[PDB]
A paper describes a structure:
Here we describe an O-methyltransferase-like protein, [name], which is responsible for the hydrazine incorporation in kinamycin biosynthesis. [name] catalyses a unique SAM-independent coupling of l-glutamylhydrazine and polyketide intermediate via a rare Mannich reaction in polyketide biosynthesis. Particularly, the O-methyltransferase (OMT)-like enzyme, [name], from the kinamycin BGC is determined to mediate the C-N bond formation through loading gluN2H3 to the polyketide scaffold. Biochemical assays and mutagenesis experiments demonstrated that [name] catalyzes a SAM-independent Mannich reaction including hydrazine-carbonyl condensation and the following ring closure.
We determined the crystal structure of apo-[name] to 1.87 Å resolution using the molecular replacement method, which exhibits a symmetric dimer conformation. Each [name] monomer possesses 16 α-helixes (α1-α16) and 9 β-strands (β1−β9), forming two distinct sub-domains: an N-terminal dimerization domain and a C-terminal canonic α/β Rossmann fold catalytic domain. The swapped dimer conformation is mediated by the N-terminal dimerization domain of each [name] monomer, which interlocks with each other and forms an extensive dimer interface, covering a total surface area of 3947 Å2. Structural comparison analyses of [name] with LaPhzM and MmcR revealed an extra protruding N-terminal α−helix in [name] that can further stabilize the interlocked dimer structure. However, PdxI possesses one more N-terminal α−helix comparing to [name] for the formation of the swapped dimer. Notably, although the overall structure of the catalytic domain of [name] shows high similarity to the SAM-dependent OMT LaPhzM and MmcR, there is no incorporation of SAM in the determined [name] structure, in agreement with the previous finding that purified [name] is free of SAM or SAH. Further structural comparison identified a unique solvent-exposed and negative charge enriched pocket between the dimerization domain and the catalytic domain in [name], which corresponds to the SAM/SAH binding pocket in MmcR28. Sequence alignment and structural comparison of the SAM/SAH binding pocket revealed that the critical glycine-rich GxGxG motif and F241 residue for SAH binding in MmcR/SAH complex are replaced by CxGxG and L252 residue in [name]. Apparently, the bulky side chain of Cys introduces steric hindrance for SAM/SAH binding and the replacement of F241 by L252 also eliminates the putative π-π stacking interaction between SAM/SAH and the aromatic side chain of F241, leading to the reduced binding ability of [name] for SAM/SAH. Given the uniqueness of the solvent-exposed pocket in [name], we propose that this pocket might be the substrate-binding pocket to generate 9. Intriguingly, the loss of SAM binding is critical for [name], providing an additional binding site for gluN2H3.
Residue numbers in the entry:
A (entry chain B), B (entry chain A): 3 to 361
Amino acid sequence: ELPPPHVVREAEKARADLQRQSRELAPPPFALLELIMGVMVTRAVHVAAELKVAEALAEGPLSADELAGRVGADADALGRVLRLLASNGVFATRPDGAFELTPMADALRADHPMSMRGIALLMGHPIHWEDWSGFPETVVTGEPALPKLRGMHAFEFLTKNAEYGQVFFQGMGSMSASETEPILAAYDFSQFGTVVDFCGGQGALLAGILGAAPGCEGVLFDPRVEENGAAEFLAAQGVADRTKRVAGDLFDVPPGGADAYVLKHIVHDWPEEQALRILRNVRAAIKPGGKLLIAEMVIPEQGDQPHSGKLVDLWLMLLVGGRERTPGQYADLLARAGFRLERVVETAAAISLVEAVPV
Amino acid sequence: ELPPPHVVREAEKARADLQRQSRELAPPPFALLELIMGVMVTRAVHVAAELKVAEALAEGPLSADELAGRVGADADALGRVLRLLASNGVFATRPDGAFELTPMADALRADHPMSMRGIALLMGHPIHWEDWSGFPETVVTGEPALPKLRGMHAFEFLTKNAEYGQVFFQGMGSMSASETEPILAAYDFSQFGTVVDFCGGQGALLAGILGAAPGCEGVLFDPRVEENGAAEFLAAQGVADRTKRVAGDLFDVPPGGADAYVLKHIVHDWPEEQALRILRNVRAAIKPGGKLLIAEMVIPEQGDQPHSGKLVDLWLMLLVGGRERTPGQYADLLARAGFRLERVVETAAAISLVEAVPV
C-alpha cells in the first residue's frame, strides 16, 4: 500500500532538513566540491549496472575475486568501485572482504519492480554522455543541444538509431514506472465513463485507469499504437475489451467528447508554441463536463526545497527544448489554450495531476 | 585558526549519520536515482562557474533577467539552472525571484582563497569529459583509460596540450589549496633544518613549511621548477632566500641528507612498481635521522564510512593507474622500500601525513 500524499510531503521536508543540516556541518568549499564531483558517482553506478553486479550478488555475498570472475571485470578495480558505492548506501562491504546487496543496490537489478537499471545505463551511455557536453551552449543560447550535435530533432534521432532509442526509452521507463499507482491512489478515475490516454504509448497508465475503474472505457491514442506492443500488453492486463486503439499523430485532434483527456509527460517535451498547439487540439475535442488531466512533475511556485522536476527540467532543456512548469505557469499556458486550471492534485510520488476544464 | 581535528571527525560522523537517515526516509529506488543524476548537478555547477555568476552577484541579488546581459546567457535557461543549484545550497532564491549568493556559491568566485572554480571547470571540460567515457573499460581491465584513448600517459598529454594542462593544474589547485594550513597545524616542521619538497610544483606547500619554520632551509625539487613560475611564487612568498630550486626527473634520486622529504600527492599517482621506485630513490637520498612525509588521503582500513579518498581513488584508477591506500597498505609499501611507518598524522581536512623513518 502507498502512503497518503501528505505523509510523503512530510518525509520530503524532513529529508531536505537533514540535507541542509549535513551541508552546514561542512566547510562550504568542501560541500561544493562534493556536488562538483557527483559525475564520478554517476560513472560508478553506471559501471555497476552495466556489469550486472546486483544480479550477481542476488544469491549472496561474493568476494571481489569471485564477483569479478562472474561479471568479467578486474577484481581490484571492481572492489574499489564497490567500496565507493557502499559509502553512499549502494552495496555493502563486510569485514570478511565480501560485498553484498543493500536496498538501493537491489534497485539496480533489471527485474526489480521499480528498477533504475535503465536510467543508470542511459546516464553513462556514450551518446547521452556527449549530449551533456552541449550543456554550456544550451544555457548560453537557450536552444537544445541535440539538434546541433545530431543534425536532427531528438525524436528523429531516436527512431533512426533504434538501439540507442531502446536505451533512451528504458531510461525514461525507470522514472515513469513509479507513477501509475500514485496517480491512481490520488485521483478517482471511476468518475469517468470514457478516457483518452493521449500519446500513452503502450497504454500502461490507461490499463491502470481501466483496472481501477471497471465502468470506464479507454482510447489509447498514439501514432505507434499498432507497432507499440500495446495490443499484447492491454490484453495481458485484461482490459483489451474496454480499449480502442487509435493511430493518430501527436499534433492531431484526438477523438471528441471523452470524459477525460490524460496527457502524461507530453506537455513537458515541447517548446511553448508546440505545447500550445497540442493543448488547443485537445481543447477542440473536449466538451463541457470533460476534464483535461496533465500528469507532470509540477515545480512549486516558490522556495528552494529539492524537487525532481527541478532536475528533470534541465534534461528537457538540453534535449528537446521543453520544460517543467509551476502551477502559475500551467495556469497561464492553459488559459492561452482555452482551459482553466481547477486544481493541482499531488500524489505519493513526485508527479502531480494538473486538472483543467474547458472555458 | 583551524580546530583540532576531533571537532572535524565528529562533524564528519554527524554528516554521515544525517545522510544515512535521509536515505532511510526515501524509497530506495529514488535515493539511488538521486546518485545516478549527479552528472547533471556537475554540469549545472560547471556552467555557473564558466559564466561567473558568483562574481555577477557580488554587488547584490539579481533576477535571471538582470543576469542575462551581465553574463551573456539566456535569461530563462540561466534561471532554471540557478533554481536547481539553489535547491542544493548553491545560490538562493529570494521571495521576489532574484538570486543571491550563499557560502557555497561564494566558493565559485575565481579569487576565493579556497576557490573551487578551477575544479568546477575541469570537471566539465570536454577533454576530461571524454576521458571519463573510458571508465567502464578501466573497471573491466584494471588499466587506465588515457593510453587507450589518447596514446600516451595522462601527464604526457598534459605537457603536450598546454591549454588543457592549465585547466588540469587549476583544477588540482582548487583541492590542493585546502591542504596546506591543515598540514601545518598537524605537524611540527620547526624540528627540521632542511626540507625537500619532492615534486612540489610551484612550491605552495614548501613555502607554507618555510613560513612555519623560520630557521628551516628548503629544496624545491621539480622537473618543471625553472618553467612553472616557482621563482616568482617563492619570491612573492618571501622564502626565496631559503629555497634552492632543483630541476630533476620524478624518477631521479633527490638531493641527499635532508632532514625531511615531503611527498604530497606523488605516491598515489603511480602503479606499485613505479611508486616503489620513487620511494627507493628517496631511501637512497635520506640519511639516518631523516623523516619521510607522505601527504595523501588515507582510506580507513574498515567500514563503509564516507571518505574523500574513496572517490579520488576512482579518478586515479581512470587517469594514471594509481590508487589511494589504507594505513596497512602504506606500511607494506614503505617496508618494501626500506622505511617503517611511524605515524599516520590526521589533519583538520581529508588529507593525512604518513610519517616514516628509514630502516
